[PDB]
UniProtKB/Swiss-Prot annotation:
This is Carbonic anhydrase 2. Its main location: cytoplasm. Changing L195 to E/H/R: Strongly reduced CO(2) hydrase activity. Zinc. Can also use cobalt(II) with lower efficiency, but not copper(II), nickel(II) and manganese(II). It comes from Homo sapiens (Human). It is linked to Osteopetrosis, autosomal recessive 3: A rare genetic disease characterized by abnormally dense bone, due to defective resorption of immature bone. Osteopetrosis occurs in two forms: a severe autosomal recessive form occurring in utero, infancy, or childhood, and a benign autosomal dominant form occurring in adolescence or adulthood. Recessive osteopetrosis commonly manifests in early infancy with macrocephaly, feeding difficulties, evolving blindness and deafness, bone marrow failure, severe anemia, and hepatosplenomegaly. The gene is CA2. The active site is at H62. Changing T196 to S/V: Reduced activity.
Length: 258
């Protein structure tokens, strides 16, 4: 009964193995735009992906992840609410069983068709594993996906997914430029929170972009053809791998805009 997104092992059950699931700094959250606070002191984000080096793409079971060479010192997220520099290690998505749900963060309760997380670790701490043990260990850039026109910079991802249908499969995924996954504007909300899969560690500065990227119905539908199961096991399509919004509790969501 490893955690996952079935009826028996899904988000409602995670607290039994990971009691921090009911903790004080859990993610995702609903972003209530009336109660979020515009902070004029929040500076622009700095996302430098020019020299990011993608390596491989893996079906981990609950989702797929594209991994990067985080020995590169130039593929970095910094600025914004951050007081350090953070190296890109991987990205992945969350999505639904239909276009009407799939995002983890919500905006005034609005759910998007999917959400992209670009995960970066703090260069103060040596590596990812050591970083997640610190309250400022990770900076995750979250980006909503809505269905409309196609996102060209996502196509290489969409095209490869048929090769990694079942858990444990992977593919070469070199020369992928994650700049192609960013919207035009980098206006953002930000708050302190957690990983949204177990172990749910409270080590993340969340930066959630106001502007969603547009992806086509065809592109997001490919996500739903992935499987949670391993090869030869009964087919279980990989859908609804999003943790729902958790209580904000003490925290203050801040915005770079009104
Ligand atoms: Zn995520």
């Amino acid at each position: 009964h490893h955690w996952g997104f079935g009826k028996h092992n899904g988000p409602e059950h995670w607290h039994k193995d990971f009691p921090i699931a009911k903790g004080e700094r859990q993610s995702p959250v609903d972003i209530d735009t009336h109660t979020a606070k515009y902070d004029p002191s929040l500076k622009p984000l700095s996302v430098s992906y020019d020299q990011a080096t993608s390596l491989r793409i893996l079906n981990l079971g609950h989702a797929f992840q594209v991994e990067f060479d985080d020995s590169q010192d130039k593929a970095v997220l910094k600025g914004g609410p951050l007081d350090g520099t953070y190296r890109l290690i991987q990205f992945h998505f969350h999505w639904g069983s239909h276009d009407g749900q799939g995002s983890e963060h919500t905006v005034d309760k609005k759910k998007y068709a999917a959400e992209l997380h670009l995960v970066h670790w703090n260069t103060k701490y040596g590596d990812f594993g050591k970083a997640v043990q610190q309250p400022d260990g990770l900076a995750v850039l979250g980006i909503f996906l809505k269905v409309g026109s196609a996102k060209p910079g996502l196509q290489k991802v969409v095209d490869v997914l048929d090769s990694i249908k079942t858990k444990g499969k992977s593919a070469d995924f070199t020369n992928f430029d994650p700049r192609g996954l960013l919207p035009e504007s980098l206006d953002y909300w930000t708050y302190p929170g957690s990983l949204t899969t177990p172990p749910l560690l409270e080590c993340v500065t969340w930066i959630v972009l106001k502007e969603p990227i547009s992806v086509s119905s065809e592109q997001v539908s490919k996500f739903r053809k992935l499987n949670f199961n391993g090869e030869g096991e009964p087919e279980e399509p990989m859908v609804d791998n999003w943790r729902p919004a958790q209580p904000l509790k003490q925290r203050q969501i801040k915005a770079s805009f009104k």
